[PDB]
Every structure is written in C-alpha cells, then in structure tokens.
Design a binder for this molecule. Structure first.
Ligand SMILES: [Mn+2]
Ligand SMILES: [Mn+2]
Lengths: 342, 333
C-alpha cells in the first residue's frame, strides 16, 4: 500500500509530529519542517483544529483543566494557545514540498477537513480521543485517503466499528497505531505485542505512535511488523511547549531514525538460502573420510569410515548406505571419500 | 516447554557460550561461571569434545588450517589446545549449581555424549557444523532432551531431516537458532526475519545465536519470537562482563515491553478515555426543540452521550430544558 509516493511495504514510514512544538511561531514551524527532513523523517504531521473543533467555551466543571500547567483554566483556552493557525497551512505544506518531506495533518472536526481539502492531503490522522466518533471517522473515510488511527483509548468494539466504516466507505487504506505512553510510564505497560494483535484481529496495517524515549519501542515495533512510526518532534531542547516533555530534538530524532533504519535492514529476508559467509563456513561442515587405509575390495565400516571436519568428503547422509559396500580403489588414511570410491 | 527447571514460555532463555574463552585454565573457567550469574544469564554452555571427536590427526591438506592464528597448523592441533578437558566438567557442573545458574554442554561426537550422560544434562547443543550429520543428530535426538540446533550452515533439506529425525525418535523439544555472523558482518546480512520463518516452516521453537555487538539483534529477536539468546562470553566477538550484563538487561527490557496481545484498556488507558469525544449541548435547547448539528456537538470530554447516538439523536425532540455546556444523557430525547 502507498501513502502518496511512499511504499510502506518497502520502507518504514517515519512521521515527525510537528504538534504544538512550534510554540506559536511560524518561523520555528518552517525551521522544524526542514530539520525533520534533514533528520531523516519521511513525513511531517501537523494538527489542524480550532478550539471549536475540540471542545466548548464553557465555565462548567467538565471543561476546566485539573492540576496541569492550566490548573484552573478552560479547555477552550488551552486549545487556543496550542492551535496551529489556518494561516500557516499554506506555508507549511509548501515548505514541506520544497524540502522534499511529506506533509499531512490531523483534523479534529468537520470544518478542519473542509479546510484541509484545499491542500489535497495524502493522508489523514485520527487522534486516539476521536477514534470513538463514528461520524467523524466516517467523514474522514469518505476522503478515500490513507487514514492512520491511534488506538490509545479505543475499545475493540470501536476498532471493529472503524473497520466496518472504512469497508462501508470503500476505503482500503486503514492503518492502526499502538500508542505508548510518555515516561514516567513503565516499560511493562508498553505492550508492544499489541502491534501484532492489531494486524491479525482487524486485517489492517499497523504502526507505532511512540511517546517514550530511547530505541526500545521503535526498534521492536519494526520487528513486530509496524510500518508507520510516529514520534513528536521539536527543534530545540529549550523550546518549552505543551509537548516538549516527551518530544525529540533534532539530535534524538535523527538518532531514532538511524536506529529504525538499522532495524529495517537487519530484518532482512525470510529466505533460508545460504549466504556467501554461510558457504565459507560450510567448508568445515561434517563429511565422511577414511579413518584407516582401505585396499581395493575392502568393505567400509565404522572402523575405517569417520564423520569429521572439513566437509570435502562424502555428505554424512551416505554413511548408512556406504557401510558394508566394497572399495573400488586404494584409499589412504585421511582421504576424502567421493562417489565412485565404493 | 521446560528446559530443566526453566520455563521458556515465560522468560527468554539466555545462554552464555563459554566456548574456548577459558584460555586452557580451569581457574578462569570457574570465574566465568560466577560472572554469568552476575550478568543475568540463565545458563552457561560449555563444549565437550576431544580432537578425535572433530577431525583426523593428519598432515594432509584438508586437515591443516588456513589464514588464522594457526595459519599452517593442523585442525587436530587447534582442537587439542581449545578443548575443554573432561576432568573439568565435574567441577564446572558443581560450580554451576552453587552459583544457581544452569549448565549444559555441546557434544561433538558419540563418545562425548556417553561421557555427558553421567551428568544428566538438561539439554544438548548441536553446533552448526554438526547439523548436516543425521547419524549424529539422531544419536542426540534419542536422548529425549531439549536439543538446541544452530542453523548457521544447515540447508533447508537438512533442517527438514532434523525435524523428521526428532519426530522419528519422538523427541518434541527441538529448538532452532538463527545465526548472525561476527564483525565484519554487515547489519544488512543479518536476515533476522528467518527467526519467524524457522518457526513457521518447521514448527519448532526459535532462538538467536548472536556473534554481533550491540543490542539490535537480541532486542529484535525477542520481538520476533525468539525464546533462546546465545552469546559468547569471556571474563574477538565475545562479550565481557559489562557487555553481557548490558545485553541481558536490554533483552529483559524487551521482554517486559512486549506485554500482551490483549487489547484491553489498562489503568493509564482508562484515565485518558475521560478526554474522549461525547455529545454535548452546543446551545441552549428548550423542551420540545429538535436536535440538530447546530445544538449538538461531539466534543471532549467524554462525560456526555457516546457519539454512537448522534445519528439516532438527530431529529428527536428534547424532553427537558437543556442548557449550553450540559452533557447529553439518555432521557434528554
Ligand atoms: Mn502523540
Ligand atoms: Mn557461536
């Protein structure tokens, strides 16, 4: 299957999430896009929403944040500061095109999709929190583009309902991501084998949305069959934002890309053919040799035939058939047995 | 599957290959066994052979080594110096029990197996070079013990014959290892996907014999389904105590991060579902007003109606006065 011009069955699709790590600056946003391409990412993912896309402008208990940096402010106000403006989208997509990196966005409402259609995005991203919204999922499926869905909070019934919707809307490019929580979350809670379970149960392509640090999660995801890797990206390590705690800077993201690319090539082939190095080591494989001198007409036995290294003699499969036959030639001790010697 | 007292379906069986890294001194060998437990290995594997077990005492071209440290010497001479003497096995096995680590050996001839039977080994190891010897494989398979086999040089036909032999001799504990060559071997040449193919084609347990440095091969092997990791240990391609301990911790890190296939929501996943989408009143709604896009909005948090009701809810009438920002519930329509 293909995302834009990218074959995800040949290379792992590494996505750098621009997220809110532009810190409200278009200059930092454009600087981050070219650096993600320099880091080795294949696509940049921005978030397209307005506060109306996400929540309600209300003073009620449900809509005020508890305990965070916004310990008593509104959800509408939080999403306002972290929003990626519509005004930047023209420059963001064009800057990604100039740098050669792919670009797509994560919408959060119907209005964001209608705005995104003017860019004709190669793919769509459904965040974990919007996965249980069938009407939103159906609206994105009608776009007939590869859709990546985060399964962080979705139940199996909801994941099954997502599949039926994509089959209903005749959209075959559905990808499911396993989510890993950000530290101090423990490694035991990663459950990276859910990548395999997601592929088997729902017959979709699978990937990893990694909010953890290090190489354990992305490197194992490649081995587990994940073909899309998503990591949050920020240009600077002092660029404080709403996601700077679990994001990667240019150095760590480039290092993660190299770790994932090494895993890809180290996955190699299923074929059990003997490589050039394996054939060089097969010289010292077991083979049948003469463990004593054998005159013509003498019969072969355990006493004059021995399975030894190197492999220049008869293959050890001949041992039972060879035993009891008569030598056709004079065989000195240490001679490699050949066909015709018996 | 159980190897001795080790249950291989719960934990990855990490084997430290002592090989000839004792340098011909029993004092160094016993120190290596004590370090394997500190590194986190579950078993140490020694080699049981005499030069007769491997090759012939001959000066002919076939039996002289080319290009190594033994650039023109005999194969018989190399195996004589690198041998693990039979006299050491008793102390080696007794040291393994005292340190709490498992111990088994790699035989290379019939005579070596009969010597090992006095120790009742939990498992046997067939080196790659002996994998094409069906008479040797049949002899080891008849021991009815878990047998780990290196597929480094074995052909597909030979691997099938090993399975047929183990099926013939009714020994079901057959394990195949994928081999990775040592430096200068490239990462591209690893072909670690053969771990899965070995499991699929031959219906055996799979493992990794790693001669490479780093964590790429062992950590990926855990993800690929390997339940045996084999590494050479020394107190050129071996690992010291620090490198082996670092690899063991890396392998155990991979195990815990593998987790479950189960897709149930964990405690952390349930905490984040609070911020899932739900149906709320996006305007004030008087009793008897019909619901529409203008007065119903799917938003965060999740305290309102589940978004599945959006199609059914649209067009129905409110049964009560609903204010803006109110979570929609069953009975509001
Ligand atoms: Mn994320
Ligand atoms: Mn080895």
């Amino acid at each position: 299957m293909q995302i834009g011009n990218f074959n995800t069955d040949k290379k792992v699709f590494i996505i750098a999430e621009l997220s809110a790590n532009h810190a409200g600056s278009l200059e930092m946003a454009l600087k981050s896009i070219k650096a993600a391409k320099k880091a080795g990412a294949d696509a940049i993912k921005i978030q397209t929403y307005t506060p109306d896309s996400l929540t309600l402008n209300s003073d009620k208990e449900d809509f005020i944040i508890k305990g965070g940096l916004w310990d008593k402010r509104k959800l509408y106000e939080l999403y306002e500061s972290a929003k990626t403006p519509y005004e930047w989208h023209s420059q963001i997509f064009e800057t990604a095109q100039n740098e050669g990196i792919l670009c797509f966005s994560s919408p959060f409402a119907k209005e964001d999709v209608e705005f995104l259609k003017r860019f004709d995005p190669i793919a769509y991203k459904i965040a974990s929190f919007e996965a249980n919204d069938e009407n939103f999922v159906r609206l994105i499926a009608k776009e007939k583009k590869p859709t990546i869905v985060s399964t962080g909070i979705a139940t199996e019934e909801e994941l099954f309902k997502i599949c039926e919707i994509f089959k209903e809307e005749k959209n075959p490019d559905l990808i499911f991501l396993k989510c890993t929580s950000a530290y101090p979350a423990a490694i035991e809670d990663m459950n990276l084998k859910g990548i395999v379970s997601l592929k088997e149960k729902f017959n979709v392509e699978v990937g990893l949305s990694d909010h953890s640090f290090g190489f354990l999660a992305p490197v194992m995801a490649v081995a587990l069959g994940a073909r899309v890797i998503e990591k949050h990206f920020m240009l600077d390590k002092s660029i404080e934002s709403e996601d700077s705690k679990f994001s990667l800077d240019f150095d760590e993201f480039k290092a993660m890309v190299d770790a994932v690319r090494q895993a890809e090539s180290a996955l190699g082939d299923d074929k059990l053919d003997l490589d050039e190095k394996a054939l060089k080591n097969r010289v010292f494989a077991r083979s049948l040799y003469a463990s004593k001198d054998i005159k013509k007409g003498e019969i072969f036995s355990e006493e004059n035939v021995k399975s030894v290294r190197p492999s220049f003699g008869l293959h050890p499969k001949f041992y039972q058939e060879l035993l009891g036959k008569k030598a056709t030639k004079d065989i000195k001790f240490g001679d490699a047995l050949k066909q015709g010697d018996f």
